[PDB]
Amino acid sequence: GEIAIAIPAHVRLVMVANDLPALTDPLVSDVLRALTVSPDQVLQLTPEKIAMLPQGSHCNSWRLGTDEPLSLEGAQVASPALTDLRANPTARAALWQQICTYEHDFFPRN
Amino acid sequence: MKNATFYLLDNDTTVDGLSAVEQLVCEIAAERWRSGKRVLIACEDEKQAYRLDEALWARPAESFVPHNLAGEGPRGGAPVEIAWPQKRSSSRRDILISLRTSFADFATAFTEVVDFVPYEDSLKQLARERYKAYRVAGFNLNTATWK
Lengths: 110, 147
Prior knowledge:
The complex is a heterodimer of chains A (110) and B (147). Chain A has 110 residues and is of the alpha/beta class. Chain A is built from four helices and four strands. The chains are: A alpha/beta (110), B alpha/beta (147).
């Protein structure tokens, strides 16, 4: 595996989805704020490309509408596609619940 | 300074089991959180708390407002915590949205408090009593309409 896609130094969240939404989307923006992640710290990538990341990558991620877990070390939050998340309140509460389970990865104590 | 704001409602329309006040609470809590504040919603009863805990995942529309009932959520509590009299809350909070019928002493610990003047005439006197109480407690008072 010669050529690979490297995660920028300032990126702290990899967002994966078939359809990459706009980081300024109302719902996406609130989820990023919930994760205490600024949009500038986000790397958006379609499911493909995850296979192009260097073996040994470590970054938290949030995937939408993609059941198969990423081959990327880190806290992995998963939710339905954005379309479905936006219309399912239950799905949103579940996403938060999932985020809380990983509080140590997103809301480190200090 | 302590600042208390009383939002004056112009209707008492109930939607999905939510009073006009509780509906406005969802809007206010979301806007304050989004502005970077840690919010405490002090409900008069446990049952009201569960009503808002559910309501906040549906409204405001197209929003994701991270919240939990007082004793749940992440350490230090969720950004938006919903409590009731029989349940101690998380510290380190910037704004209090109180649904208490009478002046609550734990309100004095806050720099920012939001209270309401319901539409139904039968509740306006309680609201007036609360107003005077904030005045006595040293809060800077002001009324407003939400838009």
